[PDB]
Design a protein around this nucleic acid. Sequence first.
RNA 1: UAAUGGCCCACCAAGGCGACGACGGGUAGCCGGUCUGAGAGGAUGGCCGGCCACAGGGGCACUGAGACACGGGCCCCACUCCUA
RNA 2: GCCGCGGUAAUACGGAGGGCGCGAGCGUUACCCGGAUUCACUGGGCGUAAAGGGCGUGUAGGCGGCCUGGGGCGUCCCAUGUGA
RNA 3: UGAAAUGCGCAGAUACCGGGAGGAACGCCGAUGGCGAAGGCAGCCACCUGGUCCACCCGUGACGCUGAGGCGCGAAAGCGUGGGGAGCAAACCGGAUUAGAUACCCGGGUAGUCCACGCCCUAAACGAUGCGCGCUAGGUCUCUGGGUCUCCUGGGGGCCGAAGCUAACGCGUUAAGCGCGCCGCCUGGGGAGUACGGCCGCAAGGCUGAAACUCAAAGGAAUUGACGGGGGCCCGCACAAGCGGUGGAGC
RNA 4: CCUACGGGCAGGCGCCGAGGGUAGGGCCCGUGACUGGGGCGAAGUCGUAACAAGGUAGCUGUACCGGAAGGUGCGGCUGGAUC
RNA 5: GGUUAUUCAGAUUAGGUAGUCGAAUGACCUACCU
RNA 6: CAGUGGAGGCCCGAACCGGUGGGGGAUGCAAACCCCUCGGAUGAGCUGGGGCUAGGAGUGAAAAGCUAACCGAGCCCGGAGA
RNA 7: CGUAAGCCCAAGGGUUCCUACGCAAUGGUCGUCAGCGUAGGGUUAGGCGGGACCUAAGGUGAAGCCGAAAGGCGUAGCCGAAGGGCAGCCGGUUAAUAUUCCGGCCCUUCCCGCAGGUGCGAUGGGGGGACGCUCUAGGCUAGGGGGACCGGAGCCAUGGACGAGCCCGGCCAGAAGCGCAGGGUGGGAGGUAGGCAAAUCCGCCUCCCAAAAGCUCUGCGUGGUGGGGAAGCCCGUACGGGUGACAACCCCCCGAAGCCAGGGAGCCAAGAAAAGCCUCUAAGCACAACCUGCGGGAACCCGUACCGCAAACCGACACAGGUGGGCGGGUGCAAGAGCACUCAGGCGCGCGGGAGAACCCUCGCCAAGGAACUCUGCAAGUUGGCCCCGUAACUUCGGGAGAAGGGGUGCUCCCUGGGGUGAUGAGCUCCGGGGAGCCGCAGUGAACAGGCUCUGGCGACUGUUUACCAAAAACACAGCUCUCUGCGAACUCGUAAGAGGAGGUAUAGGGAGCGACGCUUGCCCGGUGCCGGAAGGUCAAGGGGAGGGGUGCAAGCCCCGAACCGAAGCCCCGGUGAACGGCGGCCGUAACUAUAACGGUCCUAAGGUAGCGAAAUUCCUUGUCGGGUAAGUUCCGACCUGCACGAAAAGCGUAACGACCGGAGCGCUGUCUCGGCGAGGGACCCGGUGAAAUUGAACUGGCCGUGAAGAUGCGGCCUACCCGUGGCAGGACGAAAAGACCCCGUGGAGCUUUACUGCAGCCUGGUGUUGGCUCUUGGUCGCGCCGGCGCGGCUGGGGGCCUAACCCUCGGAUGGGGGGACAGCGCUUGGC
RNA 8: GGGGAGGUUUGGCACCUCGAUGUCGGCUCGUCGCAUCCUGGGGCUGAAGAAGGUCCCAAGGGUUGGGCUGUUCGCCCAUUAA
Length: 271
Amino acid sequence: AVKKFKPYTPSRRFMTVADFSEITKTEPEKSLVKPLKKTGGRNNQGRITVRFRGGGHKRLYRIIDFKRWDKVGIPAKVAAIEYDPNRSARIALLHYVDGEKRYIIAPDGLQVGQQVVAGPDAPIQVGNALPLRFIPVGTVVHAVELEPKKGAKLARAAGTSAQIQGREGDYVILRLPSGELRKVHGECYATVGAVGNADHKNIVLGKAGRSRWLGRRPHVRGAAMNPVDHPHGGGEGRAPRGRPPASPWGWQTKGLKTRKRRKPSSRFIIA
RNA sequence: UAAUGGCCCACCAAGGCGACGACGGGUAGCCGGUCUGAGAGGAUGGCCGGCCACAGGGGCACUGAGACACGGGCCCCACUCCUA
RNA sequence: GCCGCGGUAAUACGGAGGGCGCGAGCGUUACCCGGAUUCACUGGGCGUAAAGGGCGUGUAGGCGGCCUGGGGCGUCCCAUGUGA
RNA sequence: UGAAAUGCGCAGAUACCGGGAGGAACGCCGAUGGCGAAGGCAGCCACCUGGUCCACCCGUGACGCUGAGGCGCGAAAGCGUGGGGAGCAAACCGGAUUAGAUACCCGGGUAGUCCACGCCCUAAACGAUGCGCGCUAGGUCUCUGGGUCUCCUGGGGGCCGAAGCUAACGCGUUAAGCGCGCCGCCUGGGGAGUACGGCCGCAAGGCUGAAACUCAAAGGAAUUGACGGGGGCCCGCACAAGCGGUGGAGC
RNA sequence: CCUACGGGCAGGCGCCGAGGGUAGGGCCCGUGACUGGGGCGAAGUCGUAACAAGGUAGCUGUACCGGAAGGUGCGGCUGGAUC
RNA sequence: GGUUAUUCAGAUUAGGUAGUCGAAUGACCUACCU
RNA sequence: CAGUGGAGGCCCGAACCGGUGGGGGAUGCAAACCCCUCGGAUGAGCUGGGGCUAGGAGUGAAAAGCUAACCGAGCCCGGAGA
RNA sequence: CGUAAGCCCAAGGGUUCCUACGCAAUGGUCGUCAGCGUAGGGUUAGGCGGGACCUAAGGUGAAGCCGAAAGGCGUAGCCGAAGGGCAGCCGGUUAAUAUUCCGGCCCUUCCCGCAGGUGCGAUGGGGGGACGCUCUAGGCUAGGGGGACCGGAGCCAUGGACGAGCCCGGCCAGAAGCGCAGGGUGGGAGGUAGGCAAAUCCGCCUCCCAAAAGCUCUGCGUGGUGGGGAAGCCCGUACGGGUGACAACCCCCCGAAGCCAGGGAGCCAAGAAAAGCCUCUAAGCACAACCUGCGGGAACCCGUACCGCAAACCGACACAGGUGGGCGGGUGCAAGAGCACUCAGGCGCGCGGGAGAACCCUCGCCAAGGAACUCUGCAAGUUGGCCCCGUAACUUCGGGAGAAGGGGUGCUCCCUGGGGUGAUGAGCUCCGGGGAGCCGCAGUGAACAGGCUCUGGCGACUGUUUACCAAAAACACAGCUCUCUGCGAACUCGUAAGAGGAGGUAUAGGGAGCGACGCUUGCCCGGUGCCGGAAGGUCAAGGGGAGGGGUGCAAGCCCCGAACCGAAGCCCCGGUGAACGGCGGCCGUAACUAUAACGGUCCUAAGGUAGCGAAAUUCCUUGUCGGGUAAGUUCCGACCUGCACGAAAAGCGUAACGACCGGAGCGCUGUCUCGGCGAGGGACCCGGUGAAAUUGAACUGGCCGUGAAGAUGCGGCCUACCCGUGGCAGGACGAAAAGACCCCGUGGAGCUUUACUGCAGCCUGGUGUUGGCUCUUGGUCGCGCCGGCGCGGCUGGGGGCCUAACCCUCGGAUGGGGGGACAGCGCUUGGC
RNA sequence: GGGGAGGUUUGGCACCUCGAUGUCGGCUCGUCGCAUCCUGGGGCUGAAGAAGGUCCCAAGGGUUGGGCUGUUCGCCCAUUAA
Ligand SMILES: [Mg+2]
Ligand SMILES: [Mg+2]
Ligand SMILES: [Mg+2]
Ligand SMILES: [Mg+2]
Ligand SMILES: [Mg+2]
Ligand SMILES: [Mg+2]
Ligand SMILES: [Mg+2]
Ligand SMILES: [Mg+2]
Ligand SMILES: [Mg+2]
Ligand SMILES: [Mg+2]
Ligand SMILES: [Mg+2]
Ligand SMILES: [Mg+2]
Ligand SMILES: [Mg+2]
Ligand SMILES: [Mg+2]
Ligand SMILES: [Mg+2]
Ligand SMILES: [Mg+2]
Ligand SMILES: [Mg+2]
Ligand SMILES: [Mg+2]
Ligand SMILES: [Mg+2]
Ligand SMILES: [Mg+2]
Ligand SMILES: [Mg+2]
Ligand SMILES: [Mg+2]
Ligand SMILES: [Mg+2]
Ligand SMILES: [Mg+2]
Ligand SMILES: [Mg+2]
Ligand SMILES: [Mg+2]
Ligand SMILES: [Mg+2]
Ligand SMILES: [Mg+2]
Ligand SMILES: [Mg+2]
Ligand SMILES: [Mg+2]
Ligand SMILES: [Mg+2]
Ligand SMILES: [Mg+2]
Ligand SMILES: [Mg+2]
Ligand SMILES: [Mg+2]
Ligand SMILES: [Mg+2]
Ligand SMILES: [Mg+2]
Ligand SMILES: [Mg+2]
Ligand SMILES: [Mg+2]
Ligand SMILES: [Mg+2]
Ligand SMILES: [Mg+2]
Ligand SMILES: [Mg+2]
Ligand SMILES: [Mg+2]
Ligand SMILES: [Mg+2]
Ligand SMILES: [Mg+2]
Ligand SMILES: [Mg+2]
Ligand SMILES: [Mg+2]
Ligand SMILES: [Mg+2]
Ligand SMILES: [Mg+2]
Ligand SMILES: [Mg+2]
Ligand SMILES: [Mg+2]
Ligand SMILES: [Mg+2]
Ligand SMILES: [Mg+2]
Ligand SMILES: [Mg+2]
Ligand SMILES: [Mg+2]
Ligand SMILES: [Mg+2]
Ligand SMILES: [Mg+2]
Ligand SMILES: [Mg+2]
Ligand SMILES: [Mg+2]
Ligand SMILES: [Mg+2]
Ligand SMILES: [Mg+2]
Ligand SMILES: [Mg+2]
Ligand SMILES: [Mg+2]
Ligand SMILES: [Mg+2]
Ligand SMILES: [Mg+2]
Ligand SMILES: [Mg+2]
Ligand SMILES: [Mg+2]
Ligand SMILES: [Mg+2]
Ligand SMILES: [Mg+2]
Ligand SMILES: [Mg+2]
Ligand SMILES: [Mg+2]
Ligand SMILES: [Mg+2]
Ligand SMILES: [Mg+2]
Ligand SMILES: [Mg+2]
Ligand SMILES: [Mg+2]
Ligand SMILES: [Mg+2]
Ligand SMILES: [Mg+2]
Ligand SMILES: [Mg+2]
Ligand SMILES: [Mg+2]
Ligand SMILES: [Mg+2]
Ligand SMILES: [Mg+2]
Ligand SMILES: [Mg+2]
Ligand SMILES: [Mg+2]
Ligand SMILES: [Mg+2]
Ligand SMILES: [Mg+2]
Ligand SMILES: [Mg+2]
Ligand SMILES: [Mg+2]
Ligand SMILES: [Mg+2]
Ligand SMILES: [Mg+2]
Ligand SMILES: [Mg+2]
Ligand SMILES: [Mg+2]
Ligand SMILES: [Mg+2]
Ligand SMILES: [Mg+2]
Ligand SMILES: [Mg+2]
Ligand SMILES: [Mg+2]
Ligand SMILES: [Mg+2]
Ligand SMILES: [Mg+2]
Ligand SMILES: [Mg+2]
Ligand SMILES: [Mg+2]
Ligand SMILES: [Mg+2]
Ligand SMILES: [Mg+2]
Ligand SMILES: [Mg+2]
Ligand SMILES: [Mg+2]
Ligand SMILES: [Mg+2]
Ligand SMILES: [Mg+2]
Ligand SMILES: [Mg+2]
Ligand SMILES: [Mg+2]
Ligand SMILES: [Mg+2]
Ligand SMILES: [Mg+2]
Ligand SMILES: [Mg+2]
Ligand SMILES: [Mg+2]
Ligand SMILES: [Mg+2]
Ligand SMILES: [Mg+2]
Ligand SMILES: [Mg+2]
Ligand SMILES: [Mg+2]
Ligand SMILES: [Mg+2]
Ligand SMILES: [Mg+2]
Ligand SMILES: [Mg+2]
Ligand SMILES: [Mg+2]
Ligand SMILES: [Mg+2]
Ligand SMILES: [Mg+2]
Ligand SMILES: [Mg+2]
Ligand SMILES: [Mg+2]
Ligand SMILES: [Mg+2]
Ligand SMILES: [Mg+2]
Ligand SMILES: [Mg+2]
Ligand SMILES: [Mg+2]
Ligand SMILES: [Mg+2]
Ligand SMILES: [Mg+2]
Ligand SMILES: [Mg+2]
Ligand SMILES: [Mg+2]
Ligand SMILES: [Mg+2]
Ligand SMILES: [Mg+2]
Ligand SMILES: [Mg+2]
Ligand SMILES: [Mg+2]
Ligand SMILES: [Mg+2]
Ligand SMILES: [Mg+2]
Ligand SMILES: [Mg+2]
Ligand SMILES: [Mg+2]
Ligand SMILES: [Mg+2]
Ligand SMILES: [Mg+2]
Ligand SMILES: [Mg+2]
Ligand SMILES: [Mg+2]
Ligand SMILES: [Mg+2]
Ligand SMILES: [Mg+2]
Ligand SMILES: [Mg+2]
Ligand SMILES: [Mg+2]
């Protein structure tokens, strides 16, 4: 399920790593209209905008098909399950009958071989994607859109997925990977079933360096800093939050909700 | 060596033993016999006869048909005495 | 020795008379066998008294139907040596 | 609820109709019922699969029975990772009862209960009855199978009882009878399923398992009784219905 | 040093060698502040858990909890009383 | 009239505990056990 | 079980990175050096070159450390003859 | 000196290069010398580097978006290189340059003409370029070793040797072709809806063949031939030129980290772009134009000296510091870029000479003792590599381990096993095993080179840090919990546009705390925070207008103003602890004593659970007891009356780890008893050069007084010839720094909060942007009709639907889709 | 109950020193005082002797090594003429 390690070295005694059995003996990404330069670290003034990112292995961006209604009715064969270094999910290089090739988030169950296709006609079989007004309520589906003709947003994380609770007018109900309850549009496309590689959560970085390869840098407790730096700044011998625990910017992080009441996305939720 | 034997040595082979109790630990001289018990059994080995082992502890060989020898020899340790 | 005895009327303590047993002995203690069929081969048990493994499956081991025949290992019998 | 109180309720509860979500368990059939080695197993559907009984007497020809150790299974609780989470519910909080009430009753409530995988391996894991085989009256109802079929025959499940066993209680062709094979276990109560050592286990723990000391017993079954905040039937100025009186005052 | 001149004894060296020394393990006995339970013994304190429906049926594996017996949860058991 | 605290005097008990129960005074408005 | 295999913020140790202890130096060789010693040394490694982020701002495995040899708020010129 | 202190690149430097003349200053002395002064020379390129090539981060930036101005963001494009692409190797010559001049061999583009060939043609399509880490094969080269073989001028010393003697040297480049070794690459045919319908290309489907060759490319070897070529000897300041051969130019071995290179295998952290190059076609052309050969022609710009681990760069200095890449020989040691010695090459560090005092530094040794030293074994010492034997608690089963403790190690002769090249053999080489023996005090004989154990604390671990007094027990960390966030995400930067988050989507991202792992994490929501709560209470603008006012002759104009409607917030109600936080006092009680399982009682929001406990917490205190020592305020084990532990500012524990901090023991020692001798670099003396802080001026003694209370300087007494040199640190309240402590100033600044007052931000009502239709409750005026029905403007509120503003988005759309009069933004209201 | 001496303690005062008079303990080197710990001389003694006690005189010299703590001090070990 996951590769363990004999403790021939500390850290290595706890560190597990995925088994890329599901990866169809295919190191190389499809160099074709498929990879792409990628880089970053912080924002477009020179300034850091997101703490503690940076460093960590070089990456190639694999272009992914998230609209998947360009090729309506056009089938394609699942040529490969590939490793994507920049999502939790695994990917499927699938060849279209067209001779067109793209990538898709490999869902659980997908076998290299499987035919697959998008469109309203399509079979409610694992892999195929089609509008929502069209999937039988109760179906667990993934890689969903949100507003129609707009690309997939919901449920793309590894082994995640949402179910259809019901329909209701031009909209359908969904239960997001978060448990949220939402009316999405009927005409929203969604590939069927749930996401590949659900085994993900159980890896265990195990050592410090491994987090670093991930490009995540060390992150330092508020407690550790000084008043200039951060509201937990009293430092004065390991010390108690002196107040309701806050962000480096001093907004409460202890439980305070942040979501803009008067958001219009509002009257389409329930969870 | 009186003589067989890994009894001892060199060389080679990878074996030998074990729940049918090896290996270890504890305990003990064994026997004819003796005590007990209806008997099967149990307990036992004083005296007597046989066998074994030992001679303050340990090691050794010499002489010899025979001993590694209680009242023989060499050595070490412990112990007693003599001393110039 | 055990069951127990002695808290006013003691055949259970101590003394007495008397009696019983055995006598150059009589008691105590120690240890062995017996009683103990209480390790049970002789000769024991397990529903509730102590005691059936929580249940399978199987290794070794133990045990094994009817008839003919060969050997004769156990088994049996005879003689003979031995059992000082 | 014994009666209550905490609790919920005008911020609109309880009762009622409609709509939706989610988890768990499977009413009636149901049983003195069946199946499985045991633990154990219950809506319906299919799929995959183990055992078992009967008929025909066709095949192999003693290939068997047991079974230390080993290996597997092993209720509930409990553990690890991850889900799930309606009702219930140790812990916990509150109400009440009480001398007190860390309980019984009530209101609330978390692990847990459910699933996947992994571990734990215990039990009144009980028929307190090891498995196999042959022997030794019958009566009764019941499940299941075969046969011209007011009944014979085989396999289970019960109650009553031949002989016989048995300390009694009870057993009795479902033996605790009569016999053989093999395994497991017992050897006075307490100390103690403890300690040490070993081996398992994430832990909680489990397996193996003493002794010092100490007691005159510990016990099984049955018999008389007496007692029960056990039951049934019945009696008495016992209570009730009823009239006086103490308790108060003085003596 | 002896010789019948071939050799012998003395002596030297080496092997092994009692034991002694050093170091590290194993088994066992004694002992140790203190601590754990256990057994017996005045007529001590606190409750009343079990025996009768023992006054909440009992026991039991486990789990939590509690001055203490013990209580509760989950399952199991009659070795449970009463129509 | 009520609440509470305490106390001994009784009361219920075979008896004790406790309690209930009663009274006084100050303040105030059925349970266990021998 | 043996073989093969060749993992690892694994071990010893130079380069390289670093600064643990002591001595020396203290108008120094040196405005942080020297010697002996010591830490890391396939990694959260070291490093050349090209770039971006700055003053209540940046950067910070967090010392209020660093930001051109003194940073609890850089340097310069100015308000200023506060 | 020789993994440099030698040699070649790059950066920085900028004439420091070479000559000639010269020494005032520069040079830490000297100077005839110089890196110094004067002057003259000196740097040569199609092929090396860079530009007339590509793209990276980034920058710039037509469009476009945003901002008071300045300016910000930004597409295409353009700029940007130690990365991609691209054609030169050996040797000679100068005082000074040289893949640059010359010699030799060998190449590249451009244009022209031509031959042959082909649908030609790009900025567009496609291929390719095009990629990580670790380990690694085959073959080869650089490089290196041996040679009795090839060449060579020479040498016989000092006892021996005329020899398989000694010493020197036995290479370098090279087109075609050939060979060896490797990389790259499927071929053919049909169909095609895709690569923004341009395709014979690429992709995808179908079948047939060859499964490898062939073709293509690269490395090496060879290869016509060109080159070079030592020791030693004569001339020689200089520095070379001759000799010096007509040189020889050959075998064998070791051998890369380099080459073949886009090789192979494994792994997870999943590993640039763009042009060149190839191919496809479009427009356009097919007398063009592409392609291949040959001939003739053309080929610019900039760098090129010298220094370059330093006396030429950065450090004010000819500064013991700092500075990226390549080469970096031999021998020995297990290996190596380590160590010792040494080639080549380069240096003796730009003050010397003496002396042989103290004292200081670096170093050596020491009788007996062996931690008694001391805050501390600080420091030194011991140990030290490899080989074999052996190795404990505990453990997370890997560890602990180099545990511990041991033995071996040199040289000679003999027997012998295996691997490599060759061929299987010899020779060479790599790694061994067995016996016999020799010498010394000692055999990793020198240099490199661990002392060890036991037991506490904290922290899991490797890591990080206060550049320049702190390296830690602090930070970090894998891991745990809480919390926010549904995507135009939350959050952060920005006035905005926008960006980061993320080309991510709840297995994700932001915040917070805790900090491997094991076992666990108790009670208290009264206060605070947060979350929930369509009721109520208060509450601003605004709406409303009874009622009152000013003025006017009036119509009016103007102002004040009650009820009543009006958000968020606060109040109120409930939840909430891995949210801020909190978690008691007193009296009585048991067989003697003591104690208190029991009770009582006051207070509370609730009174601290496990576990730990004189502790990184314990005041009293060196608590008390045990251990250890002759002796122990430390340490370890216990008890617990915890001044003042305690459960994620986590509680207890835990193998391993540690330049952490504590205690103990063994080894060893000059740490000490207790010092002594010796070495060198200073100190001292002579010659050259020649500072500094400091300094009221000085002709500057002791004592006892005294004085502003600590006198060379007043008094009194005592002592004392003048001047120096080497020494010591008691005084000159010695130097240094306008005391850091302390106070003061209505001085400053950083930090905090439930100080005050703002501001950003965020919440919020009205309103502008702002529209349509419809249902129903309230108002409003006219009418029909006995306070109510029907109607329209006005409506105010609430529900629903619409779409066209506004927002998002869609193969660019005068459009489709989604949201939608909301949101966003403007003004304004009150809040936090 | 009373009177003093000293100037080693704890203090009070705030006089020099805040354009600086470095703090506890140790080491090293001491030197002074005597109010004497030893040794020398003596008086009394409830001094037999021996050993002591108390006071007087006397600085000449001497006045150990370790354990524990930063300690001074103190406790402790082994001594000493002390
Ligand atoms: Mg952190
Ligand atoms: Mg702050
Ligand atoms: Mg704080
Ligand atoms: Mg801090
Ligand atoms: Mg603190
Ligand atoms: Mg033998
Ligand atoms: Mg052999
Ligand atoms: Mg014996
Ligand atoms: Mg004996
Ligand atoms: Mg017998
Ligand atoms: Mg015997
Ligand atoms: Mg015997
Ligand atoms: Mg005898
Ligand atoms: Mg005898
Ligand atoms: Mg003897
Ligand atoms: Mg004797
Ligand atoms: Mg002897
Ligand atoms: Mg004899
Ligand atoms: Mg003898
Ligand atoms: Mg004798
Ligand atoms: Mg004599
Ligand atoms: Mg004599
Ligand atoms: Mg009598
Ligand atoms: Mg009697
Ligand atoms: Mg009598
Ligand atoms: Mg008697
Ligand atoms: Mg017997
Ligand atoms: Mg017997
Ligand atoms: Mg028997
Ligand atoms: Mg029996
Ligand atoms: Mg059974
Ligand atoms: Mg026969
Ligand atoms: Mg369970
Ligand atoms: Mg639990
Ligand atoms: Mg049962
Ligand atoms: Mg019966
Ligand atoms: Mg009968
Ligand atoms: Mg029987
Ligand atoms: Mg047991
Ligand atoms: Mg048990
Ligand atoms: Mg044991
Ligand atoms: Mg656990
Ligand atoms: Mg009365
Ligand atoms: Mg003779
Ligand atoms: Mg021998
Ligand atoms: Mg009871
Ligand atoms: Mg009760
Ligand atoms: Mg109950
Ligand atoms: Mg009960
Ligand atoms: Mg009962
Ligand atoms: Mg059961
Ligand atoms: Mg019963
Ligand atoms: Mg019962
Ligand atoms: Mg009274
Ligand atoms: Mg390795
Ligand atoms: Mg490492
Ligand atoms: Mg480096
Ligand atoms: Mg100095
Ligand atoms: Mg500033
Ligand atoms: Mg300046
Ligand atoms: Mg001014
Ligand atoms: Mg080096
Ligand atoms: Mg010049
Ligand atoms: Mg030159
Ligand atoms: Mg000059
Ligand atoms: Mg000069
Ligand atoms: Mg100089
Ligand atoms: Mg001259
Ligand atoms: Mg001259
Ligand atoms: Mg000259
Ligand atoms: Mg030009
Ligand atoms: Mg734009
Ligand atoms: Mg460009
Ligand atoms: Mg070039
Ligand atoms: Mg022509
Ligand atoms: Mg073409
Ligand atoms: Mg092109
Ligand atoms: Mg590259
Ligand atoms: Mg020749
Ligand atoms: Mg000669
Ligand atoms: Mg030579
Ligand atoms: Mg020579
Ligand atoms: Mg070949
Ligand atoms: Mg096409
Ligand atoms: Mg076409
Ligand atoms: Mg073609
Ligand atoms: Mg063509
Ligand atoms: Mg070759
Ligand atoms: Mg060649
Ligand atoms: Mg040639
Ligand atoms: Mg040049
Ligand atoms: Mg340098
Ligand atoms: Mg300079
Ligand atoms: Mg110099
Ligand atoms: Mg080299
Ligand atoms: Mg010099
Ligand atoms: Mg010495
Ligand atoms: Mg010595
Ligand atoms: Mg001493
Ligand atoms: Mg100390
Ligand atoms: Mg040291
Ligand atoms: Mg060790
Ligand atoms: Mg040698
Ligand atoms: Mg070492
Ligand atoms: Mg570290
Ligand atoms: Mg520092
Ligand atoms: Mg963005
Ligand atoms: Mg954005
Ligand atoms: Mg992005
Ligand atoms: Mg992501
Ligand atoms: Mg746990
Ligand atoms: Mg807590
Ligand atoms: Mg209401
Ligand atoms: Mg009016
Ligand atoms: Mg008027
Ligand atoms: Mg109104
Ligand atoms: Mg409001
Ligand atoms: Mg809690
Ligand atoms: Mg509080
Ligand atoms: Mg009371
Ligand atoms: Mg203390
Ligand atoms: Mg203390
Ligand atoms: Mg003490
Ligand atoms: Mg206390
Ligand atoms: Mg907390
Ligand atoms: Mg806390
Ligand atoms: Mg470290
Ligand atoms: Mg001042
Ligand atoms: Mg003032
Ligand atoms: Mg002020
Ligand atoms: Mg209306
Ligand atoms: Mg409205
Ligand atoms: Mg709508
Ligand atoms: Mg629309
Ligand atoms: Mg719409
Ligand atoms: Mg238009
Ligand atoms: Mg809509
Ligand atoms: Mg001054
Ligand atoms: Mg001064
Ligand atoms: Mg001071
Ligand atoms: Mg006297
Ligand atoms: Mg005297
Ligand atoms: Mg006097
Ligand atoms: Mg005197
Ligand atoms: Mg004196
Ligand atoms: Mg003290």
